[PDB]
Amino acid sequence: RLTELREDIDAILEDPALEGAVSGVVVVDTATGEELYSRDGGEQLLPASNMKLFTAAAALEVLGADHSFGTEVAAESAPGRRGEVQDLYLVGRGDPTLSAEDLDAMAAEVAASGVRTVRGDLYADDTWFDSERLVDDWWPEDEPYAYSAQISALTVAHGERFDTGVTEVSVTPAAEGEPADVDLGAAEGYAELDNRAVTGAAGSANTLVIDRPVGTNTIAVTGSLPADAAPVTALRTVDEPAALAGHLFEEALESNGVTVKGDVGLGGVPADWQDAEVLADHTSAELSEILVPFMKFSNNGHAEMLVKSIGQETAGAGTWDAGLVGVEEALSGLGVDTAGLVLNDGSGLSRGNLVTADTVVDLLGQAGSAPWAQTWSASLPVAGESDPFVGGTLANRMRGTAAEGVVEAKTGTMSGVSALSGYVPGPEGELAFSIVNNGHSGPAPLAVQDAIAVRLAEYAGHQAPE
Ligand SMILES: *[C@](O)([C@@H](C)NC(=O)CCCC[C@@H](N)C(=O)O)C(F)(F)F
Ligand SMILES: [Mg+2]
Ligand SMILES: [Mg+2]
Q1: Of 164, 278, 288, 386, which has fewest CB within 10 angstroms of its CB?
Q2: Are 250 and 113 in the same domain?
Q3: Looking at residue 101, which CATH number applies to its domain?
Q4: Which ligand is in closest contact with the Cα of 353?
Q5: Cβ atoms < 10 Å from Cβ of 465
């Protein structure tokens, strides 16, 4: 039955959608170590978001499953009878899940501690990581979009998915001829607005564009929204995520009865502060719980923050240079051969990343027999699962196939780069696989990837749910 499988994958790989593409495909039985299929497995390819597999495993080795993240509010000394402080500091230490609600709860704690007036300025301290916001080879044209958000120690995460360093723009039509209404979300009064957008006639064509022009903190809205059209919402990144957090914190303080008399800006807690008074703190959920929104939806910002958190633990440097070496060592310490790996970031957004399909499968084996294996696999998207927090990037794929509910795999997609890697659990044995496509021209060869993943589920002894 093993020859039948080899013939089937050979035929799937001759799909015309893979014209001019190099594709690494490796399948291994983890119970035996048997190499069921291998094609260009040593070839170096861009992984896209399959890079997160390496990042996640390294984070669980370096930081541990029980690891959580802190944010604190600091003043030089406690407030007195008059309840006055001078300068106040919001200090972030790499929480990727810090919501506006959490800023509110910290504002309430600052009020309940006796502070009524912040007489000086309020500062956002994100010096726990460096101020290098973006990886060198990331494309400037990508910068307005959530997956390309700037990386900071102090950032506000949006929604239940915890998209960091962004704001929600909402555009609403008005009457035909009148300007569209633009709602900047959290970045209201932080980011500049350039609204050139108009409301078009009922039934006219939607031509609405929402942009942040490179190197500015301005949201430029252009084009035309039809009068009868549904409101358009989009996540856009801001410049200096910590400063936005600072902005949102002032609003939180002012709403909890604390007057801020000064300005909002960046600044680290001064060195000459003898014994800083912690007026409020927040602790995140543990890394095992954080891994879910991170891996399920493939959060880029989370990955880069984790890398720099690795840099802090291994070296006390919230730095790409440190964290990426930290990732490499952690993988080596796990039993993974890192020869074919080139690490340029944690998210896989960098086109300077390189993996081989063998290395991915190697990692999947070593991860499978690790103490944190269950929190590891619980994070991976599950083929065909309706629940977005279970299905993830695989939620609307492989439904009604042998793979549905069974295959746990990480996706990866950019221009000319597509990947699918994970496990096929079968009664006799757990299968591990990697599929990495580079150079194809159409859209991601998802049909090809799904066909292989389904055939392997069938091989492992599964049938399609009906
Ligand atoms: C993952 O594959 C990540 C790395 N990909 C993206 O976030 C999309 C990046 C777009 C880059 C753009 N310049 C291009 O199309 O090449 C995953 F799963 F998150 F998508
Ligand atoms: Mg939303
Ligand atoms: Mg505001």
Answers
A1: 386
A2: yes
A3: 3.50.80.20
A4: 1
A5: 12
Pure H helices in 185-299: 241-255, 287-296
Ligand 1 centroid vs 249 CA: distance in angstroms?
A: 31
Ligand 3 centroid from CA 184, angstroms:
9
Listed in sequence order, the residues at least 6 apart from 196 whose beta carbon sits closer than 8 Å to its beta carbon are 220, 221, 222
Q: Do residues 356 and 326 share a domain?
A: yes
**Ligand nearest, relative to CA of residue 243:** 3
Indicate if 87 and 192 belong to the same structural domain: no
Q: What is the number of domains present in the chain?
A: 3
Amino acid letter, residue 307: V
Distance, in Å, from the CA atom of 107 to the CA atom of 259, rounded to the nearest integer, reads 11
348 lines ligand 1 (CB under 6 A): yes
Q: What angle do CA 436, 55, 442 make, to 5 degrees?
A: 25
Q: Which of 172, 173, 221, 167 is nearest to 191 (CA)?
A: 167
Rounded CA separation 115/437 (Å): 57
- 452 exposed, middle or buried (CB, 10 Å; 0-12, 13-18, 19+)? buried
Q: Is 167 close to ligand 1, i.e. is its CB under 6 Å away?
A: no
**Is 410 labeled as ligand-binding?**
yes
* Cα–Cα distance, 290 to 376 (Å, whole number): 11
Alpha-carbon gap, residue 412 to 51, rounded angstroms:
8
CA pair distance 400, 342, nearest whole angstrom? 37
Tell whether 431 and 390 lie within a shared domain: yes
Q: Which atom of ligand 1 is nearest to the CA of 419?
A: 2
CATH of the domain at 462: 3.40.710.10
Ligand 1 atom with least separation from CA of 51: 4
* In a shared domain, residues 459 and 356: yes
Q: Which amino acid is at 395?
A: A
Which range marks the domain in which residue 439 is found?
Answer: 1-68+285-466
| One domain for residues 229 and 275 | no
The Cα–Cα gap between 360 and 49 comes to 12
Q: How far is the CA of 249 from the centre of ligand 3 (A)?
A: 10
CA of 420: how far to CAs of 286, 382, 410, in Å?
27, 12, 6
Strand partners, 183: 170
Resolution in Å, one decimal place: 2.6
Q: Are residues 136 and 217 in the same domain?
A: yes
Between the alpha carbon of residue 167 and those of residues 219, 235, 405, the distances in Å are 10, 6, 34
